[PDB]
C-alpha cells in the first residue's frame, strides 16, 4: 500500500515531457508503467499484485515485429500520460483508469500487417471482423487477458463502472484505426469553429479521446529528431515486409510498402506529416491548449524531413 515505484532522477524529470524516450532498457518499462498509473490514476487505482500480473500477461501477447511491438505499447501510453497530466481536471477517475490500460493494450497480438493485407489475404480475422479488423482483435485480446484468473485489475469496480471502463477501452481502441480518424477529425474541426463542441455530451468526449488515441497512437513524430528518424526505419522495415508478402500474393503494393522504392521515403513522410500528424496535433492543440508541445515537436520533424530532401542531411 506504501510502496511507491521511483525512477532515477533524469527519468523523474524526463518522463513529465512529451518527447520522452523510454530507453533501451526492456526491463524498466512495466516499472516506467507503473510509476505512470501511481501519479496519473493514484496508488490505489490497481492491486499491484494483479496490475504487476496484467502488465507481464500484456508484454507476452505482443510479438516480436520491427514496430508494433512492446516498446510501441508503453510508448504511445507514456502520451497518453502526457496529455492527461497536462489536462488534471478535464477527465474522470474512470477515464485515466481505462486510457492508460486501454493505449497498453491497444496493438496486443500485432503481427506487422496492416487491414488491407489481412483482406487480400483473406486471414481469418477479416472474416470475423469486416471493419477496423486488427483493432477489434486487439480489444477481443484486451477482454481475454482481463478474465485471467487474478488479472482483473478492475475487479473493485461496481457493475456499472466496470462496463463504462471497457467502454472506454473499447472505443479508445477502435479509435486507433487510422481509417477512421480523417472523419472524427473533420467532425472535430466543424464542432470546434462553429462552437457547438461540448465536454459533457458523451459523443462528444468520445470523438476527442479518439483524436487522444490517434495523438497518443502517432507520438513517434513527436520526439527528437533522432528518436523520429530510427523510429521511421522500424515502421518500414513493417512495411516492406507487407510489400514484400503484397508481391508474394500477386499484387504491387503502394509505394509506402515496396522497398525498391526507398528514395521516395523523404516525400513520402512529407505527405503524411502534412495530411495526418500535423491535422491530428492542430485540432488536438485546439480544443486541449497543453497539448500544443506535441505540435510544436511534430512541426520540428517536418522541417527535418524537408532538409533530408534538400540532400542537407
Ligand atoms: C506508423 N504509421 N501508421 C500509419 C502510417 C502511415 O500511413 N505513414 C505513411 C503514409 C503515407 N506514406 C507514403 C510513403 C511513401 C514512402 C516511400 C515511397 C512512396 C511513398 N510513406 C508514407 N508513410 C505510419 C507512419 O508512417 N508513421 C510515422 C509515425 C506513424
Ligand atoms: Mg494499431
Ligand atoms: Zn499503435
Keep these: 500500500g506504501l510502496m511507491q515505484f521511483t525512477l532515477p532522477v533524469r ?9 520522452f524516450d523510454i530507453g533501451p532498457f526492456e526491463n524498466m518499462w512495466p516499472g516506467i508503467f507503473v510509476y505512470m498509473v501511481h501519479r496519473s490514476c493514484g496508488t490505489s487505482c490497481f492491486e499491484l499484485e494483479k496490475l504487476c500480473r496484467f502488465i507481464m500477461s500484456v508484454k507476452k501477447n505482443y510479438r516480436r515485429v520491427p514496430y508494433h ?6 510508448t504511445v501510453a507514456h502520451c497518453m500520460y502526457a496529455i492527461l497530466q497536462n489536462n488534471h481536471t478535464l477527465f474522470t477517475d474512470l477515464e485515466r483508469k481505462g486510457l ?11 503481427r506487422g500487417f496492416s487491414n488491407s493485407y489481412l483482406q487480400k489475404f483473406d486471414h481469418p480475422l477479416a472474416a470475423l471482423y469486416s471493419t477496423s479488423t486488427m483493432e477489434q482483435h486487439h ?79 502517432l507520438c513517434s513524430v513527436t520526439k527528437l529528431w533522432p528518436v523520429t528518424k530510427l523510429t521511421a526505419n522500424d515502421i518500414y522495415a513493417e512495411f516492406w515486409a507487407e510489400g514484400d508478402e ?14 525498391d522504392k526507398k528514395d521516395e521515403v523523404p516525400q513520402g513522410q512529407l505527405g503524411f506529416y502534412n495530411a495526418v500528424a500535423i491535422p491530428c496535433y492542430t485540432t488536438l492543440t485546439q480544443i486541449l491548449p497543453p497539448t500544443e508541445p506535441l505540435l510544436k515537436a511534430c512541426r520540428d520533424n517536418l522541417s527535418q524531413w524537408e532538409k533530408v530532401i534538400r540532400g542537407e542531411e
Design 11 to 19: 527519468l523523474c524529470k524526463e518522463i513529465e515531457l512529451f518527447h
Design 69 to 74: 511491438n512492446w516498446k510501441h505499447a508503453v
Design 100 to 110: 492508460l490500460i486501454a493505449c497498453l493494450c491497444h496493438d496486443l497480438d500485432h
Design 139 to 217: 480489444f477481443s485480446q484486451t477482454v481475454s487477458i482481463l478474465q485471467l484468473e487474478g488479472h482483473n485489475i478492475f475487479s473493485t469496480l461496481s457493475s456499472s463502472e466496470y462496463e463504462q471502463v471497457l467502454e472506454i477501452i473499447r472505443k479508445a481502441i477502435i479509435a486507433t484505426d487510422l481509417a477512421l480518424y480523417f472523419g472524427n477529425r473533420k467532425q472535430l474541426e466543424e464542432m470546434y469553429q462553429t462552437g457547438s463542441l461540448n465536454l459533457n455530451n458523451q459523443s462528444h468526449r468520445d470523438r476527442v479521446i479518439g483524436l487522444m488515441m490517434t495523438a497518443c497512437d
Design 246 to 259: 503484397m508481391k508474394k500474393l500477386g499484387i504491387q503494393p503502394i509505394p509506402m510498402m515496396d522497398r
